[PDB]
Design a protein around this ligand. Structure first.
Ligand SMILES: [Ca+2]
Ligand SMILES: [Ca+2]
Ligand SMILES: [Ca+2]
Ligand SMILES: [Ca+2]
Ligand SMILES: [Mn+2]
Ligand SMILES: [Mn+2]
Ligand SMILES: [Mn+2]
Ligand SMILES: [Mn+2]
Lengths: 237, 237, 237, 237
């Protein structure tokens, strides 16, 4: 199976796989059963922003999510990612629906990774920023039901012509270039990610969520990972 | 054939294809026969730096090259790249040798592209920076004789175990992700590139040079493009 | 008198000082009588964005302005700023009203300056970005009627408690640090600026406009520079 | 007295104020008596690089120092800087000598601060980068014996015409603009700093060190802060 590290914005409480009884933000290290969660006062139909940060000195994966006019929610987990992930990874966004549903619309996504060596000329970096997405967005790898270009956005899960979200949908978008997150000469390695999202549902119970993830470069949507599995995991182990 | 835009650091004067009678910097638009050149006082065995800049408002491709303790050389050419190149491109470095030879060593390479739309949330960007190159540099596409990791550098052309440059060599490195240089909503599009290089030769007449280039995403080394053709063109037309 | 270079978004046509007979964008080199203008289809009450770019290789000051859902307007002028401005400058935003009036609200302002030398370790930079402004914004120098913090914005000219713009008002904001735009070792010097603005008026004829400017470090609002003089010039010479 | 947070590169062991018995890197929170140290294998006459990082989610101040061809040293301390420092600060470099001495030469200094709010348009930033220093470096506030421009470097402490370091010297350089490190709407605040330094001494026992610091905006060199006090503290409390 793939190797997954993710920050989930989990909109539906699945209590038999350890979700708390409310929407939540969570840190997922090789399992859908988050290592750490925090309550998330999700707002149906409002644009939110999530921020993800990490560095190899402190070895703490942290995330913050907010809406305008609202307080934030935050979660952190102590983890040495160099012991979890390979040296080269891809980074992405994933989302799913099940029998319950929502739009999983991404309006912007940015990422920066840096590796500072002990050489004289120390810095190495990758950065991207998307504030719009074209029909043919060649620097994204789209998987499953993900599409780009409708209203200039990334729709991770299927939305009908009406604009209504569909159930039983799973889709991801990965940045095309592999990312180097460890190197033998690096003295500090760091990354940051931000994305803005619009989760809308006609229903009092939206599902299933959006995640930012980091994986093996060849990651693909696991069989049967609609719904609670967020397009990330093959099972709920 | 591929579509090529390049800035050449041409170390060998080939007077029958329009080179001036000295090493020179040049702007190449779909031909090895530069549209504009300037004299370049190349220094064998010293580390130099080249800078390349462009934006879609002014439609002027400009380059500057220097060494420490030396004056610079610069060239500019008025060209609307949106009329020359496709919407999506790859960017790279190329170099060659022929019967005359040199090392074509790259010590660092950075690039930034930006597209600013008329939306509210206007900016889109790609940036990379390499200050070292690993044996397995997964975010570069290496072509021909190019290798990475010897002394942490990118060697575009073949160097023997002795450290001696070989003749009759051609190699390129392209950044893995495609780059979006035009978009229908962009109000300003720009790019900048910098690279540092070490061209060394045991000979009074080094050849053939290094170029930064922008091409169709599927570009590949043309047959027979050793020597004067810089790994860029199939002929001297 | 101060030395001023500016890009004006001139909302009121003053035909006796050379304005065209419509709102316009203009490049001002030491005079309110723009060296170059272009028609600007200003939209009362909509948020717009302006972009300003320059580099010392090409010696062309260019600007673009747009609104969402609208085409852009652009202007360019060939000028060697090293012959106009001192080595160290301050950068700012200015606006005015007269007998005619408008709000001159700034919602964001960013700037980047870079100087690349011929040394090994070549780059020098300053960047700032404001997406909000506090009541006590210590890294801005406010002049005249400019205030910060109302609805988190920079109001360059006076607005009453009602939210109604006042006439006969002039205000500027300068970034606190001086900016180094020429240096003897620089091989390329560049800058870019962006700002977003909301110009609203209850009147069919708003006035007078907003400008981004670059000046001597000790610049101050000239006496009598309300109205057509944009807080920038002492007279219409 | 001023309020100081600093990362020290302490070259001389003063065992009665808690220094370990070797050169060390340390985190100083309102006292010269570091809260945390780590052994630092300082190399007389070689160029080193220090990196400092912090964010308000994790509340951990961390630093790494290295030389080419050498292993790094690192230190971290859990501290909420919003409880230590004011909302607006200045950032700087300081160094000292005493009866023992060294050069305290800075070859480059960069800094980035970011404040991400919960608004739509979330990011606010300041960045600077110096890779050279001019005789008249207007965006630095020089204190005590600090000078700029000799060999294009920042000499924090006095060096004679011979190039020999002097004893009993203290000097600092602060960036001119104040820096906003907390804001009521910020959901994440972060900073990073890097500097490269050359500490040389004709003596087997160099002293006293270099620090990166963050202070109240009006900070000044305390009386009698030569030597062990690093230009930072008025006493060894
Ligand atoms: Ca769930
Ligand atoms: Ca040639
Ligand atoms: Ca006017
Ligand atoms: Ca000490
Ligand atoms: Mn969950
Ligand atoms: Mn040529
Ligand atoms: Mn005008
Ligand atoms: Mn100490």
């Amino acid at each position: 199976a793939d190797t997954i590290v993710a920050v989930e914005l989990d909109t539906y409480p699945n209590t038999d796989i350890g979700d708390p009884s409310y929407p939540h933000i969570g840190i997922d290290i090789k399992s859908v059963r988050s290592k750490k969660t925090a309550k998330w006062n999700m707002q149906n139909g409002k644009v939110g922003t999530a921020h993800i940060i990490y560095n190899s000195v402190d070895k703490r994966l942290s995330a913050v999510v907010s809406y305008p006019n609202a307080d934030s929610a935050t979660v952190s987990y102590d983890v040495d990612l160099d012991n979890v992930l390979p040296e080269w990874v891809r980074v992405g966004l994933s989302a799913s629906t099940g029998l319950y549903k929502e739009t999983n619309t991404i309006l912007s996504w940015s990422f920066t990774s840096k590796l500072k060596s002990n050489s004289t000329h120390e810095t190495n970096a990758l950065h991207f920023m998307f504030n719009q997405f074209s029909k043919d967005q060649k620097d994204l790898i789209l998987q499953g039901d993900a599409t780009t270009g409708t209203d200039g956005n990334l729709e991770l899960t299927r939305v009908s012509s009406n604009g209504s979200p569909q159930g039983s949908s799973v889709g991801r978008a990965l940045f095309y270039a592999p990312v180097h997150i460890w190197e033998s000469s690096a003295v500090v390695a760091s990354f940051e990610a931000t994305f803005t999202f619009l989760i809308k549902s006609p229903d009092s119970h939206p599902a299933d969520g959006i995640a930012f993830f980091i994986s093996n470069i060849d990651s693909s949507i696991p069989s049967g990972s609609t719904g609670r599995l967020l397009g990330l995991f093959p099972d709920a182990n």
